[PDB]
């Protein structure tokens, strides 16, 4: 049967061009060359029991073989690219082309870009504008004046995946995505902050969902957080909204992300006719950051932090003498 | 991120087998070896006006556009015959699509759904609460399922699109007023077909016909046009309330009907289409082209026998009737 799709806010699809080659030497993940780039290790593992990671020398980064400094050393290098990634993204610049240098910035350092036929994902990177909550495609669509971008990066590089993703302002924003973009990174935060030895899974989404009523958003349901290591998604599910039904709880050596998409009206999403772009039901702005984390025997340690800590939206607000919005 | 997704109903996806190549000698739709199954003259196409094929030879089974689409809808329906042949209880559904598949080649045809938007395999098996585009599985159908065979074939230039919903073993009560639902809903949609009645009056009539059987029609997904191309104009929705229909309008009528409520939701495949309440739907399907004084489909039975009936009668089970906007005191 033919599908049918009404858009739900402003932004349109624009056009999407082949995917990029990935240079021979390059030690891809088994998904990279199937058609349909299904998983097969993903179809192995799913339901599998939450995987405790080695921690005995996450505190000596001499070790670079270990299961731990391998997810630390991708995730350090993926922060590169989303780096060059975000001071690349100006008004006039089409996502096509941020997924040109996040691509290339990848594999100029000898690493496999995750995104790339991931499932048949057909692009490098994820990059999402406005109501696009998550998985947007990089297409020639050029970003205008006022939009909020998020790039949303991962590698794999010697049998591990690193992944994290944030949201920047393109050009000067105005006040309700000032909030948006400041109440998804308090989210974060407020995630994070739930993260130690002991804790209970669920309270992430208690946290989170907490946060962001405080800057009257609202918490995506249908994607989550999610393991990463050797494969790209895998358990635990960490589920950002209140009252959830994630089961289990915080161990030292576990390994995951906290990725909350954040709304400015309701939670609900819907997706675009090509199967990967959400956006929020009601068209209004969703933003998202990310951090791969592992517990620690004391608390969490994040690997893949901005250089000095300062996310960039807040470099762009403090350059532009823009305050950051108060809680409620 | 991560994707959650909560089934609805009691089906769950099996295993997926590899993907199956097709003879060399075969001709190939444009999408047929491009990564992410894209198709560049659907593309090209999107928005244009309807074409009018030119049916001067319509009848002439000897003289050309329409013969090659009547033909590649013939071969369809043996194909599709085939399928509903093997589909027995104990059988999966992925030996169902080795089965398509196998037929299809055999007569020298592309099996259209194949790599189609990257769809994995050569036909779509939809299973109970699935209301279209189920991936043939690693599960063995069920006494007491219904099951949906959806071919489309190409074959020198041109597709055919053809379905069905089929018995597996003896069907309860409730599956039996779906299924014949569902086909009085094609036939009350293919009872409007005829020059210039307008696309809008299909839904009209199907959801009337829908609501005496006490089942809701689906909205997310449409009849469409079809020939040079695997979709394209005009949208022909199901449910009640642009265009007007002409002499050589060829498309396709195909109204997924359900027990419970209309709404639809989509399995981590990113293709199967279930019911939002888990309930059953069904589904049948013609190509048709608009004549000069009607309608004429070219994807009937054999006999003109709906299979399922014909199991129904061997088995000996009653047709339900239908049942009753005004009353008088
Ligand atoms: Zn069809
Ligand atoms: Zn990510
Ligand atoms: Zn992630
Ligand atoms: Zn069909």
């Known amino acids: 049967a033919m599908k049918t799709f009404d858009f739900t806010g402003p932004l349109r699809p624009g056009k999407i061009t082949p995917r990029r080659a990935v240079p021979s030497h390059i ?12 998983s097969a290790s993903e179809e192995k593992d799913r339901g599998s029991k939450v995987k405790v990671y080695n921690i005995q020398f996450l505190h000596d980064d001499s070790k670079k073989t270990a299961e731990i400094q391998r ?18 993204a100006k008004p006039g610049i089409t996502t096509d082309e941020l997924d040109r240098i996040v691509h290339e910035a990848t594999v100029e350092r000898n690493m496999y870009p995750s995104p790339l036929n991931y499932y048949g994902f057909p692009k490098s990177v994820c990059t999402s504008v406005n109501e696009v909550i998550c998985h947007g495609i990089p297409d020639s669509r050029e970003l205008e004046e006022g939009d909020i971008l998020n790039i949303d990066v991962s590698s794999y590089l010697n049998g591990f995946h690193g992944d994290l993703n944030e949201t920047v302002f393109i050009g000067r924003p105005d006040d309700d995505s000032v909030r948006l973009v400041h109440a998804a990174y308090e989210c974060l935060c407020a995630g994070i902050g739930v993260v130690k030895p002991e804790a209970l899974y669920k309270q992430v989404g208690d946290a989170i969902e907490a946060c962001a009523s405080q800057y009257q958003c609202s918490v995506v349901r ?26 289990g709880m915080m161990r030292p050596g576990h390994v995951f992300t906290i990725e909350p998409m954040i709304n400015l009206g309701t939670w609900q ?3 675009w006719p090509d199967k990967w772009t959400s956006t929020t039901k009601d068209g209004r702005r969703s933003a998202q950051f990310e951090h791969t984390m592992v517990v620690t025997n004391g608390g969490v340690e994040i690997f893949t ?4 800590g300062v996310p960039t939206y807040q470099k762009q607000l403090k350059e532009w003498g823009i305050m950051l919005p108060q809680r409620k």
Do not use: M
Request: hydrophobic residues 35%; contains cysteine.
């Open 27 to 38: 030690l891809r993940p088994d998904y990279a060359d199937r058609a349909g780039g299904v």
């Open 71 to 88: 997810i630390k050393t991708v995730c350090q290098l993926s922060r590169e690219v989303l780096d060059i990634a975000t001071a690349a």
């Open 222 to 247: 249908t994607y989550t957080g999610h393991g990463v290591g050797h494969l790209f998604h895998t358990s635990p599910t960490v589920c950002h909204y209140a009252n959830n039904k994630s089961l």
């Open 269 to 271: 999403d819907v997706t």
């Open 305 to 308: 932090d901005w250089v000095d």
